[PDB]
DNA sequence: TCGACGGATCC
DNA sequence: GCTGATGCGG
DNA sequence: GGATCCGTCGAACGCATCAGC
């Protein structure tokens, strides 16, 4: 079925106005995304922080348009060590962070440009492009090792400051999180291994799935659709892009959105409103 | 994702 | 720059 | 033996690299 995201709630559970708007977008090709007008949409969304995944663009090749952003002038990027048109993330912020770091501090998992950590006054923001398990599940063994190192890293982070994690986590947690769960139980993104790890991630850190916390029974809300088979026109998709929050931020949570109608990738953007 | 393939298994 | 083939992705 | 179940098998879309020139 087709999905309509409800209007933005911009007041917190205590009536306080949202002060921080974070948008996250797996652009799947930063340069093509910009050519497909992605930055225009960004300028109208006007986030305070913009997190990008699957940029597929080395630092040298960053399009000129990106410095034309004066509302997101503090920009951080991470590309793979050696694979050239692969993976990649970026973090653009209105205000300068206190401290920015790349990767999770584990050599094996910090070579594919997947993680940026940005520390702000009252929280830490992580954006991540989690490794796909791969066609025929060839990288599933590696993915399970990623899941554990990433969980352990995030647990340490969240022990020192409240944590926001966003981006393409490359799993649909539960059957409500994709249109065809039955046919996908042996495909990347919906293996029991990947689903288990996501559950362990929520419990171990701990983290809450912002969108599920507010809309725990809302079906057909997805963030990705294959380019093939006209999937997006039929809303045959997966919810792969999340905002995961420390529990102590839940009273700061105003809304967690899915921007279904913004085009330019095979993912749509998602947006978090917090009252900090 | 989808429909074409098998190879069982059924009124 | 242009073709044609390969890597990758849920 | 002619339908109807199943689990496989394959090739689409899009971006970006690579090889070669």
Residue numbers in the entry: 43 to 318
Excerpt from the publication:
Base excision repair (BER) is the pathway primarily tasked with repairing DNA base damage, with apurinic/apyrimidinic endonuclease (APE1) having both AP-endonuclease and 3′ to 5′ exonuclease (exo) DNA cleavage functions. APE1 end processing of 8-oxoG, during which the oxidative DNA lesion is removed, results in a ‘clean’ 1-nt gapped substrate suitable for DNA synthesis by Pol β during BER.
These substrates represent potentially unligatable, BER intermediates in which the repair polymerase, Pol β, has misinserted an 8-oxodGTP across from either a templating A or C. To obtain crystals of the substrate complexes, we employed a double-mutant catalytically dead variant of APE1 (E96Q/D210N). Specifically, DNA bending at the site of the nick results in an open intra-helical cavity in the DNA, and in both cases the 8-oxoG base is in an anti-conformation and positioned out of the protein active site into the open intra-helical cavity where it does not form any base-pairing interactions with the opposing A or C. This conformation allows the damage-containing 3′ end of the DNA nick and phosphate backbone to shift into the protein active site for cleavage. The 3′-OH of the sugar is also coordinated to N212 (OD1), while the two non-bridging oxygens are coordinated by N212 (ND2), N210 (ND2), Y171 and a water molecule. A second, ordered water molecule is in position to act as the nucleophile. This water is coordinated by the phosphate backbone oxygen (O5′) as well as one of the non-bridging oxygens, positioning the water atom 2.9 Å away from the phosphorus atom. Also observed is a hydrogen bonding network between Q96, D70, N68, N210 and N212 that likely alters the pKa of N210 (D210 in WT APE1), thus facilitating the deprotonation of the water and subsequent nucleophilic attack at the phosphate backbone during cleavage. N174 sits closer to the O8 of O8:A with 2.5 Å between it and the nitrogen (ND2) of the N174A side chain, however in the case of O8:C both the N174 OD1 and ND2 are within hydrogen bonding distance at 2.9 and 3.0 Å, respectively.
